[PDB]
Amino acid sequence: MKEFYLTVEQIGDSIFERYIDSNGRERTREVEYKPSLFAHCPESQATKYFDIYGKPCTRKLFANMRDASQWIKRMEDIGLEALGMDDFKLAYLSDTYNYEIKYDHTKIRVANFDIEVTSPDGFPEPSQAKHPIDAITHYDSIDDRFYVFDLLNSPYGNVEEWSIEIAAKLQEQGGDEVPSEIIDKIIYMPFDNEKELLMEYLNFWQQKTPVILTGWNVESFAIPYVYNRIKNIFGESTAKRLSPHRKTRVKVIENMYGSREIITLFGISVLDYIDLYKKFSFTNQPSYSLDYISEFELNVGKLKYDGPISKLRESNHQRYISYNIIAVYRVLQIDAKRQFINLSLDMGYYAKIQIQSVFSPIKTWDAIIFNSLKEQNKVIPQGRSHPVQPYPGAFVKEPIPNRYKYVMSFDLTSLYPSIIRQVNISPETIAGTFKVAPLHDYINAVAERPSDVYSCSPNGMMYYKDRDGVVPTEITKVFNQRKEHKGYMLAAQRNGEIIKEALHNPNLSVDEPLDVDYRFDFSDEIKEKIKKLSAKSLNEMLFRAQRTEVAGMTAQINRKALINGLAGALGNVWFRYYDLRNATAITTFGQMALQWIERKVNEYLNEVCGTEGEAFVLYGDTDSIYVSADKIIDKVGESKFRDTNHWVDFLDKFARERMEPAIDRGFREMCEYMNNKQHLMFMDREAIAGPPLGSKGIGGFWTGKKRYALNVWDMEGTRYAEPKLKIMGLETQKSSTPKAVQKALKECIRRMLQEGEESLQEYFKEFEKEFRQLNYISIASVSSANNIAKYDVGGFPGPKCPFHIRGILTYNRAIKGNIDAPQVVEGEKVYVLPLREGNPFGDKCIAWPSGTEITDLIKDDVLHWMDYTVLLEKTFIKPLEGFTSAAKLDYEKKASLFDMFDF
DNA sequence: CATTAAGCAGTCCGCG
DNA sequence: GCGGACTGCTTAA
Ligand SMILES: Nc1ccn([C@H]2C[C@H](O)[C@@H](COP(=O)(O)OP(=O)(O)OP(=O)(O)O)O2)c(=O)n1
Ligand SMILES: [Ca+2]
Ligand SMILES: [Ca+2]
Ligand SMILES: [Ca+2]
Ligand SMILES: [Ca+2]
Ligand SMILES: [Ca+2]
């Protein structure tokens, strides 16, 4: 097999590398790496090295990495560019692995762990580590085993061994319900004292040294706690045994009333699953507790126990250990679904970076571009300092706030990367400039053609047409990868709807799920067999189709985020290829493209409808347009349609056969206008929206920019079994909105769009009447808690104190002196409730850590003093008023002359 | 070591 | 009692 790296570090003049050899064995080596950098030389000097602009360079080979670094400083002082890769471990990886890395994940040790620490005096701070570590569960991906380290004797209580037999039993029979499929994979190790537990854990660690280290909050809790605890008991150099190279770096962050730290373990790549989830999931959650995320991702119930966590070990050690084990398994279950570790490995090896560098689009692209240029013997430019400077982005049309009955949307494929490729935007492809006209002159095709020689953007930039740029070249590679996975995702999505259709008439038989590949559209023969399957088989097939869709989503959406990241990186001062000429060449082209095609679509539809001057395009944002299809439906006549699916089919055909070719013609003309390298402005129909035929539903509405709702029947070629609400920007979509309120507002919208005014009024009336019965957490608002200290004046609110921050200070005063009440952590999220006048908290609101029950001592008073009237008005009534006024609809029946009668 | 556009909630201030 | 300027937060893209 081909060799591949596991980890790489620079430590002084040494590169320390862990890797897999040609026999598939894990190895380590220390290399006194000899780096090269480059300097511009005169043309007369023959050389094989040229910078990206074609200027000759001389190679400077250094005896060590420090010498190379000192030379960079001298060059800076002289005032001359020092070219080449200055991150030497990236150069080392590039020299060592001068081919496309093919990696085998089964050879990569992936460790998932978590620890328990009993603390009778508040949160056990990792930097102090003053309490015993009383449980560790460490899953090893190579052994496929959960290694469980259990402390039986502690200053906080002596306990009996954990029972695997009780652990497996149902909770309803007094067991812990540890999942049956991991029971045989548990290796249990009790210890009489913490010192022997910790010594054994370190010996184990040496035997099974993580390459990838993950888990839930391991970077901020588990790692620094273990490191500091071991340091306190055995000394710092024993703690350094957690690094395979015995080197660590301690990072102390001052928070005025916090003071915590992160430990860098050299030779390990830490991928905290919380950070992976936040980067790759495209969610914004009201809480990041493992309970909440597991419930969201897996539909599993909360891990229930009686009393505080500080008393759980002494009162129920059995459950304490089982829950430590289950918590580790839950992360593995989330990853089996989301596949973020897989993604990280794919991206890291593709770029040739430390795996943890996948968090950084700048580092990722720097490496990709460096490796690409190095293949051609090209030399990369020195990174330079740049002042931060705002620049313009995308265009968003102001919509007329209204109901919109029939809507079809159209969207440009991968817009910014497509613009890069179409125009040929790269640092080395710049050909010059032209004199700009106002943007509207390009939009309306009245401005002089910029160039008949070069490829242009309406920002004034010209690019060569006849040569390749490294940015377009490398962005295309990832774009093509992305395209493949999105195809798999959409096929799985379509396959899912086929299964949902068939679940309407399940067969009464004993059968099995069909062994199929969900990444490809089912054949007719498969569809025939599906229509004869049982409900059991269908529901299992749907699970597999959806899991396939999620895997496709992870792979495609994050490759999209990477390539969009490159367009954005051009606008970040720390990017080696930072250049606002290129960053704005993209955004300005985008603005032109959207507004050009708005004009073209309006022109085309007036033409085919036999009219003039009517506005068909009602809205657009960045790369999408929304077309009112009312006149298209009316031109045929609504009574001609047999059912909803009939008009949906009609509009689908209209978009594909008539509109899309006109859109294509429009964009090909624009490409010619700008004299672009290649036409890549591909705008396809996205959504088809409207009310069910014969209903009083309004179909859709806009309240303003980035705020709308649509009743969608078909999305990007997926014909839904049941209509799906597409809601953007409205409170239903916001993590700050109370859970039960999101639910109620969504039903209000559903009724508006699908059923009409009277249906809405009936729901509103019910919700208002039952509002006070909802669980307090379900009706609490949520906010992030930043700069708490700034507004903290002796426990009371300082000037301009935000509402949520005021709530936190109220809470802090209420829990003062109580050592067991959970503290609000700076930067994390809080539930927020308004409080009625005269409450014993002495302020208008309270806030507490999100994803938790408010502490028992103050919970009673919160429930008693909650201001339901304020809560309903602020979170529910006021947003609903926005929706209904825009839609020209009432959520409550207006008084009228008819009120004089007895109906 | 490291993208912009834009809506809504809330504070402060003005307001015979 | 509301608007206008301004901060904070959180979306859409
Ligand atoms: N983080 C982001 C998100 C978006 N955009 C810009 C670039 C995108 O090309 C454009 C439109 O984003 P979309 O969500 O419409 O997705 P794309 O057009 O990129 O991809 P596709 O439509 O193929 O999914 O907005 C950006 O610069 N940075
Ligand atoms: Ca725990
Ligand atoms: Ca599309
Ligand atoms: Ca798009
Ligand atoms: Ca059937
Ligand atoms: Ca879009």
Considering only CA atoms, which residue is closest to atom 17 of ligand 1?
A414
The CATH class given to the A383-468+573-729 domain equals: alpha beta
Mutational test site, ligand 1, from A415, A562, A683, max ligand atoms within 8 Å of CB: A415
Q: A603 CB contacts (<8 Å, ≥6 apart)?
A: none
**What ligand has the least distance to the C-alpha of A412?**
4
Task: Give me the residue label for tokens 């930039």.
Answer: A461
Query: What is the dotted CATH code of the domain comprising A730-774+867-889?
Result: 1.20.1280.300
* Minimum-distance ligand 1 atom for the alpha carbon of A417: 9
**Residue A732 CA to B12 C1' — how many Å?**
30
Distance CA A562, CA A566 (A): 7
Distance CA A751, CA A515 (A): 40
Domain with CATH 3.40.1820.10 in chain A: 775-866
Ion ligand 5 contact residues with beta carbon within 5 A? A 505, 507, 531
What are the helix and strand counts (H, E) for chain A? 27, 33
Bases of chain B within 7 A of a CB of the protein: 1-12
**Residue A191 CA to B7 C1' — how many Å?**
57
Residue A22 CA: distances (Å) to CA of A109, A268, A865: 17, 21, 69
Domain with CATH 3.30.420.10 in chain A: 109-339
* Minimum-distance ligand 1 atom for the alpha carbon of A557: 24
**What ligand has the least distance to the C-alpha of A395?**
1
Query: What is the dotted CATH code of the domain comprising A1-108+340-382?
Result: 3.30.342.10
Task: Give me the residue label for tokens 């609000």.
Answer: A824
Distance CA A194, CA A188 (A): 15
Residue A409 CA: distances (Å) to CA of A69, A684, A871: 54, 9, 36
Q: A760: CA distance to ligand 6 center in Å? A: 30
Nucleic strand C near CB of residue A283 (< 7 Å): no
Considering only CA atoms, which residue is closest to atom 19 of ligand 1?
A414
Closest nucleotide (CA of A873 to C1')? B9
Considering only CA atoms, which residue is closest to atom 20 of ligand 1?
A414
Distance CA A397, CA A323 (A): 52
Nucleic strand C near CB of residue A798 (< 7 Å): no
Altogether, the residues listed in chain A come to a count of 903
Distance CA A40, CA A42 (A): 7
Domain with CATH 1.10.287.690 in chain A: 469-572
**Residue A798 CA to B12 C1' — how many Å?**
13
Closest nucleotide (CA of A730 to C1')? C11
Q: A490: CA distance to ligand 3 center in Å? A: 11
Considering only CA atoms, which residue is closest to atom 9 of ligand 1?
A415
Phi, psi angles (nearest 5°) of residue A22:
-65, -20
**Residue A80 CA to C7 C1' — how many Å?**
44
DSSP string covering A183-212 = HTTEEEEEESSHHHHHHHHHHHHHHT--SE
Q: Pick from A844, A772, A759, A761: which is nearest to A807 by CA?
A: A844
Q: A421: CA distance to ligand 1 center in Å? A: 15
Q: A412: CA distance to ligand 6 center in Å? A: 7
Elucidated via: X-ray
Q: For A29-67, b where at least 16 C-beta lie within 10 A, e where not — what string?
A: eeeebbbbbbbeeeeeeeeebbbbeeebbeebebebbee
Chain A window 642-701: residues with CB closer than 7 Å to nucleic chain C are none
Q: Which tokens go with A786?
A: 């930043």
Task: Give me the residue label for tokens 């862990």.
Answer: A18
Domain with CATH 3.90.1600.10 in chain A: 383-468+573-729
Task: Give me the residue label for tokens 């938790």.
Answer: A852
Helix or strand holding residue A14 (H, E): strand A14-20
- Helix or strand or coil: residue A489? helix
Using CB atoms within 10 Å of the CB of residue A820, give its burial: 0 to 12 exposed, 13 to 18 middle, 19+ buried: middle
Considering only CA atoms, which residue is closest to atom 26 of ligand 1?
A564
User: Which CATH fold would you assign to the domain A109-339?
Assistant: Nucleotidyltransferase; domain 5 (3.30.420)
Query: What is the dotted CATH code of the domain comprising A469-572?
Result: 1.10.287.690
- What is the end-to-end Cα distance of chain A in Å, rounded? 84
Q: A31 CB contacts (<8 Å, ≥6 apart)?
A: A14, A15, A16, A17, A92
Considering only CA atoms, which residue is closest to atom 14 of ligand 1?
A414
Neighbours of A579 (CB within 10 A): 17
Distance CA A224, CA A65 (A): 30
Considering only CA atoms, which residue is closest to atom 3 of ligand 1?
A564
**Residue A717 CA to C13 C1' — how many Å?**
21
| SS3 annotation, A542-561 | HHHHHHHHHHHHHHHHHHHH
Nucleic strand C near CB of residue A736 (< 7 Å): yes
Q: Which tokens go with A667?
A: 């964009």
- Helix or strand or coil: residue A146? strand
Distance CA A468, CA A446 (A): 31
Distance CA A227, CA A82 (A): 39
* Minimum-distance ligand 1 atom for the alpha carbon of A416: 9
Q: How big, in percent rounded to 5, are the helix, strand and coil portions of chain A?
A: 45, 20, 35
Considering only CA atoms, which residue is closest to atom 7 of ligand 1?
A416
Longest dimension (CA), chain A: 103
DSSP-assigned beta bridge partners for residue A462: A432, A456
Q: Where are the beta strands (DSSP E) in A671-791?
A: 683-689, 700-704, 707-715, 718-728, 781-784
In one-letter notation, the amino acid at residue A429 is T
Q: For A442-451, b where at least 16 C-beta lie within 10 A, e where not — what string?
A: bbeeebeebb
Q: A105 CB contacts (<8 Å, ≥6 apart)?
A: A342, A345
In one-letter notation, the amino acid at residue A16 is F
Closest nucleotide (CA of A886 to C1')? B7
Handedness of CA A339, A341, A346, A351 (dihedral sign): positive
Q: Which tokens go with A502?
A: 């068939």
Using CB atoms within 10 Å of the CB of residue A172, give its burial: 0 to 12 exposed, 13 to 18 middle, 19+ buried: exposed
Distance CA A712, CA A753 (A): 10
Pocket residues for ligand 1 (CB within 6 Å)? A 411-416, 560, 564, 567-568, 622-623
Resolution (A): 2.0
Considering only CA atoms, which residue is closest to atom 28 of ligand 1?
A564
Considering only CA atoms, which residue is closest to atom 5 of ligand 1?
A564
Report the nearest residue to nucleotide C10, CA vs C1'.
A734
Q: Pick from A653, A654, A660, A547: which is nearest to A597 by CA?
A: A660
Distance CA A785, CA A439 (A): 41
All protein residues with a CB under 7 A from any atom of strand B: A 86-87, 359-363, 390-396, 398, 568-569, 571-572, 574, 587, 703-707, 729, 799-803, 806, 874, 878-879, 882
**Residue A764 CA to B6 C1' — how many Å?**
29
Using CB atoms within 10 Å of the CB of residue A379, give its burial: 0 to 12 exposed, 13 to 18 middle, 19+ buried: buried
DSSP-assigned beta bridge partners for residue A688: A408, A714
Distance CA A68, CA A79 (A): 16
Distance CA A56, CA A48 (A): 8
Distance CA A776, CA A774 (A): 6
Q: Which tokens go with A728?
A: 């953007």
**Residue A406 CA to C12 C1' — how many Å?**
22
Using CB atoms within 10 Å of the CB of residue A838, give its burial: 0 to 12 exposed, 13 to 18 middle, 19+ buried: exposed
DSSP string covering A280-308 = HS----S---HHHHHHHHH-PPP---SS-
Mutational test site, ligand 1, from A280, A587, A623, A626, max ligand atoms within 8 Å of CB: A623
Nucleic strand C near CB of residue A622 (< 7 Å): yes
Distance CA A597, CA A668 (A): 11
Q: A477 CB contacts (<8 Å, ≥6 apart)?
A: none
Distance CA A342, CA A108 (A): 11
Q: A627: CA distance to ligand 1 center in Å? A: 20
DSSP-assigned beta bridge partners for residue A378: A50
Q: Pick from A473, A434, A440: which is nearest to A457 by CA?
A: A434
Q: For A721-757, b where at least 16 C-beta lie within 10 A, e where not — what string?
A: eebbbbbebbbbeebbbbbbbbebbbbbbbbbbbbbb
Nucleic strand C near CB of residue A729 (< 7 Å): yes
Distance of CA A658 to the CA centre of its chain: 36
Distance CA A825, CA A220 (A): 12
Domain with CATH 3.30.342.10 in chain A: 1-108+340-382
**Residue A882 CA to B15 C1' — how many Å?**
27
Query: What is the dotted CATH code of the domain comprising A775-866?
Result: 3.40.1820.10
Phi, psi angles (nearest 5°) of residue A563:
-70, -40
Bases of chain C within 7 A of a CB of the protein: 7-13
Domain with CATH 1.20.1280.300 in chain A: 730-774+867-889
